[PDB]
């Protein structure tokens with residue numbers, strides 16, 4: 257139903273192998289957004305076409321202030337097009353490169369927003385979201401926007417043991433991701449980073465990680481609770497949102 261004619265096109269916010277993201281403007285409303293233009297030659301060269309169609313169908317039906325909104329989508333002879341909510345302050349990945357580490361307050365707020373968008377995704381029957389720093393955009397007021405949309409070394413770094421060991425994964429994966437994020441926000445590096453993929457797998461599968469001196473005991477307690485080998489041993493989202501160090505350092509309500 258949407259057409260490229262309906263949009264004024266701006267500078268590239270990001271170039272990729274699968275395609276481009278443009279600053280754009282719906283000509284009618286002058287509303288400003290982001291156009292993810294994808295080349296189906298590369299939706300062919302890889303096997304993502306079906307996963308892509310799915311993701312669009314799920315994300316369209318999602319509406320949360322901490323989830324990047326997919327407004328709509330269209331296609332053409334050569335390309336796919338994705339009408340996305342524009343988040344003007346960049347990815348959390350960039351920000352972490354800027355600041356090196358985050359304070360307790362910023363970190364707890366990000367964790368609060370994530371836990372809320374992840375409990376909503378759970379209720380909406382979405383059990384997983386990648387939530388890696390490069391998939392987390394920042395809105396006008398610095399608010400987090402989960403943007404699990406696009407795929408364009410630390411591939412292993414955020415994955416829980418049930419995955420890397422080739423097993424079965426439930427909702428509890430999102431708890432492990434939180435612990436990894438919470439660690440990285442505070443320390444500037446994911447807890448299991450290593451020079452080789454094998455060493456990273458070794459630390460993940462044996463939950464082997466340590467804290468630099470400055471990470472306060474509430475922070476250690478939450479991270480430790482989250483980074484459990486057994487999935488069922490990981491707390492539910494509501495215990496994270498109601499956790500002492502969260503409640504004590506978060507500025508955004510639950």
Ligand SMILES: *Cc1cc(CN2CCN(c3nc(Nc4cc(C5CC5)[nH]n4)cc(C(=O)NCC#C)n3)CC2)ccc1O
Nearest residue numbers: 269270271272275276290340341342343344345346406408
């Ligand atoms: C899927 C994909 C991803 C990239 C990686 N770049 C994406 C664009 N980008 C960037 N994006 C925004 N704002 C934004 C992105 C989106 C969702 C992608 C649609 N909605 N709003 C802001 C900034 C930025 O630099 N901000 C200020 C600072 C610092 N950057 C960089 C990452 C590339 C290509 C594809 O296809």
Ligand SMILES: [Cl-]
Nearest residue numbers: 306307309310
């Ligand atoms: Cl499917």
Ligand SMILES: [Cl-]
Nearest residue numbers: 418419422423
């Ligand atoms: Cl798997």
Ligand SMILES: [Cl-]
Nearest residue numbers: 455458459462
């Ligand atoms: Cl060893």
